[PDB]
Design a protein around this ligand. Structure first.
Ligand SMILES: *[C@@H]1O[C@H](CO)[C@@H](O)[C@H](O)[C@H]1NC(C)=O
Ligand SMILES: *[C@@H]1O[C@H](CO)[C@@H](O)[C@H](O)[C@H]1NC(C)=O
Ligand SMILES: *[C@@H]1O[C@H](CO)[C@@H](O)[C@H](O)[C@H]1NC(C)=O
Lengths: 442, 442, 442
């Protein structure tokens, strides 16, 4: 719960410590079924207002099935889509193409509406029947059609049919514009009462059940819904839920900013920037790194990340935060001559890289300007500061409370000779730059 | 309203002038409230068709509140989400967690349904009550439930309840699949009559009211809707509207394209390309630059950009369009050996970089091919041209009318010696390349 | 239908052959019309429950038109949006601003509801009237309003009006939050029965009709819906369909992975990686290349790509797969010192780049670990393998069946001297690296 932050003046970088991990290492597949009714193209002789409304609402049921059958003919239910994140779901999606797998799940749900199943591929899958639309249609709609003259029943049956058919039409619509795969999983795909009941019945520890139940919105955002088949009066689609195998290991986020020589110009000042910024978490003796910010979602002091878009780095990678010149790890930097001003809003403050004739200030909402940044790379904590201005750009500082630490140190950009410094390294390293200088010093 | 364009043959770049600015420099927060009714889990003894429909439609009201309460437990309403664009909205979202802030806005809306409020944090916020669902439920639905036997009233009350509850269910659905933050702000979050009435009552000049009212769709696309609380029979969510503090200052868009030596090969021809293409606008003595094309939205001759994703550059940056070798500003270029053909559709024409054995032509819809591009970097105005073909790729030229200017000049790629030219500079500059040549000339 | 794959050990790259092309080279524009009724602000004297529901449902019709008129005032219907993919649609969208173009399409649809038209710009466009809402309103809703006292008719007219108005409200909502351009084209914009009937009546060969009809979901994902006008009781919007002019030409996908020297360190090992990975297809004597993976969609063994985001390359570009040192084409590589482990899931297997102390294995679901990768770049086919682990990251192998070919060869990284190797080339080439070595060897 304690959040702390350290700013390294020598490297123009900051690290936000104190977070807890929640890394997804596996998937859990569950089949959601909707009992449907196969109908003949029945038609009535007369055009009655109470019957024409049923005629129109039945067409929505007929068109939604036709649309889902078109989604069944296209990816990812067939062929492409196996080397991605929905691989575990497609495996179950492909099993249901076998017979009588649809009969195996239909027979286990006619008595409870919700049960476990064992498929022929040997995966114990929880099956849900969230809508028994066949039971409703065959009991109150099919006999009235069948007469060859249809009844003029009360119109409340028409409204009851729209409510039963409403959830089916939304699922079809969500699948139709998302190529049969939706994420996050909407409440129409799986309601809150169904998702919570699904979490409580998963082969997981009691600790992981509380974790997922207290962050159901995060679970939805990291889940997938995959359309499968319409076979034998059963509409089945797989919901792929995340399994967090790494919990409560320490995480930290690295913030970087350009570090340049301070001159005003109109001239030549060299720069360097630490690379590989993002989220780092300890994971099985190594360190998992997440470069893309879209993969990690921060809730309170816990970080939910997906290990599919991660890189495994040795634990010595944390040495770049304490000593960038260490030999145990080759810390990576990029170089340039772009002396443009910018600011990075960290967790407990803001890094400000002010260069040229740019006006960089940190202001208070009531008090006004409380700090004017000189040329270079500086830092200010959120304590008492509300906004940071860099030129014509305004940044709002994160207000979450934590203790900050300003680690004083000489900027490492002053250790290099500009006449020999490689000022255009896209993805270099400290040892790569120092040896590139030794060659030019001949 | 006049749009002009200049093509610089020396640098293989173009500039589209004549635009007006509309840069967002601030946010305006307003609270939208929905009066709700806290209910007991009341149940009836009998199952009546006219009552069961109310039973089902009431469950949607009960599930939508439960879903929004789950969104209230997750970000950005708590902790994370303060260093982003919704910072001003989260500040008001956090204030409503205090008491009796919910009672302060509920008391000011029972008489008008729409009023200003002064929160404890000292921000004058406009509050709207767009739906008084409590008044409807407690007057026509609660007494019928309460009997311990429920009435068989007319079914028009059921349809009236679905219309009142329809807007609440859509807001919950839009929030549930967007982590409680939606953009653009949909008409269900804020209708056209409500948004226009909101713009007319904002502390802004009469000039800015006409600007926002004549571009309400652009305002929606640059606005945010943030879910906050469900506390004491009131559902409150903040709508964050943009404030354009820079209006009618001149803007221009820089288009670039690779400039290579003309040889056919199968061989070694060097190339260079101007960097930092995008939108430039004058802003407070400096120039705001917008590299990402997603930040600026062009409507008629006015450019709507967000200064959060901008860089403040000195006014001398425009010298790269008139003299790329000027000493007052270090113009940036990148180099490569990739002699691949490409085309850039500008505002009033198209830049064509034709290299190798590629067939580059500009055609007319009725006439046919009217220009065959030779090897090099050329330009053609939209006057009489409808399409541009580069190899197997077809580009459609923008048809908007403007005067074009072809600035003849020797391509600067011919000034360099290929045997000494650095042909792999990711992000270099003119002075950085000329000094990199002086070192190799030893 | 045959899918094969070749892995080149010398270049740490793979190619997936056997695919068929479906490249989009043109657009087809069609106008979809909705007959509307212009009304006066009629009001009734009494507040009747059967009439108030019509009062409320009519407000949705009045607000949806006002919202679409606001979308008509903004882009892309006016000015900006011509240099993009919707250029062909905007051309027809602009023609309908002329008179009496709206009268020309309204007169051709009062008798069939579906017909071809010839606009003044000379484009034969198919026009559809998918909803005659004017006929319904003026026949059953206007006379009841007109009385100055409105009738207490049966409430089934209210439900029939919500069904007729439902499709109009969804189109307005989809346009309002997408700036008047939606993609994919939803079923509400164009139903399956309407889209199939549209494909059958297009000026295309019988071969292209079967191709589009068997992949209607892919056609929807590559189509655009553009809002145009609300003029003279007619709501018109253009649906832009793709035209595939390149069919059944061979395609292949290039997969690359870093190739480094094998040392454990903590030290200096040089690396190189083949660039320009993605989809390649033969197209008119040349080769179309698609770098972005979002442009190509793979269905079965056919690849649907958009030539707008492609590059035309000579046919000799395939020589980098058989001989990277060939002089006929200058193959491009990038260099670095980043010895981080990673894996690339190909079509019929997986490339594994294992470096350092990283644990890289390929496992079977039932059997367990079946291959332990040594340091270097290796490959394994999907035959018998289900997952691949690289450090703390788990990859699922594509299970589609094909024959794989392991092309043995010495890694080309061993041919270079590390003391003279340029280890930071962002976008270089083989001939560019060998000449960069000749300069340093002086
Ligand atoms: C952690 O937080 C607690 C607050 O209960 C505080 O007392 C303690 O000093 C903190 N420890 C740190 C910041 O190291
Ligand atoms: C600006 O546009 C007007 C059109 O009213 C034209 O007369 C004038 O010459 C234009 N000025 C330019 C292009 O500098
Ligand atoms: C192509 O597939 C057929 C399967 O019918 C097979 O018999 C043939 O050997 C394959 N040809 C190849 C892989 O070259």
């Amino acid at each position: 719960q304690n959040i702390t932050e350290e700013f390294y003046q020598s490297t123009c970088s900051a690290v936000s410590k104190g977070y807890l991990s929640a890394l997804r290492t596996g998937w859990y597949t569950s089949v959601i079924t909707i009992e449907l009714s196969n109908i003949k193209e029945n038609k009535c002789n007369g055009t009655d207002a109470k019957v024409k409304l049923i005629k129109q609402e039945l067409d929505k049921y007929k068109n939604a099935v036709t649309e889902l059958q078109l989604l069944m003919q296209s990816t990812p239910a067939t062929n492409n889509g196996s080397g991605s994140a929905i691989a575990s779901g497609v495996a179950v999606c492909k099993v249901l193409h076998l017979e009588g797998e649809v009969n195996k799940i239909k027979s286990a749900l006619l008595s409870t509406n919700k049960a476990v199943v064992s498929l022929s591929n040997g995966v114990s899958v929880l099956t849900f029947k969230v809508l028994d639309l066949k039971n409703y249609i065959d009991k109150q709609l099919l006999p009235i059609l069948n007469k060859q003259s249809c009844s003029i029943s009360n119109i409340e049956t028409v409204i009851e049919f729209q409510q039963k058919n409403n959830r089916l039409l939304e699922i079809t619509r969500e699948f139709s514009v998302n190529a049969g795969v939706t994420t996050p999983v909407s409440t129409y795909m799986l309601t809150n009462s169904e998702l919570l009941s699904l979490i409580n019945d998963m082969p997981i520890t009691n600790d992981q059940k509380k974790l997922m139940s207290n962050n159901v919105q995060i679970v939805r955002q990291q889940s997938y819904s995959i359309m499968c088949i319409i076979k034998e009066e059963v509409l089945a689609y797989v919901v792929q839920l995340p399994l967090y195998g790494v919990i409560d290991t320490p995480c930290w986020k690295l913030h970087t900013s350009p570090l340049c020589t301070t001159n005003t110009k109109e001239g030549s000042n060299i720069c360097l920037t630490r690379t590989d910024r993002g989220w780092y978490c300890d994971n099985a003796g190594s360190v998992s790194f997440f470069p893309q910010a879209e993969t990690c979602k921060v809730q309170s002091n816990r970080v939910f990340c997906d290990t599919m878009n991660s890189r495994t780095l040795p634990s010595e990678v944390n040495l770049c935060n304490v000593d960038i010149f260490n030999p145990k790890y080759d810390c990576k930097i990029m170089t340039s001559k772009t002396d443009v001003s910018s600011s990075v809003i960290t967790s407990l403050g803001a890094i400000v890289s002010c260069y040229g004739k740019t006006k960089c200030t940190a202001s208070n909402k009531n008090r006004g300007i409380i700090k004017t940044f000189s040329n270079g790379c500086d830092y200010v904590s959120n304590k008492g500061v509300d906004t940071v201005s860099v030129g014509n750009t305004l940044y709002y500082v994160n207000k979450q409370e934590g203790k900050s630490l300003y680690v004083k140190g000489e900027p490492i950009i002053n250790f290099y000779d500009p006449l020999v410094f490689p000022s255009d390294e896209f993805d270099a390293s400290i040892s790569q730059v120092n040896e590139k200088i030794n060659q030019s010093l001949a």
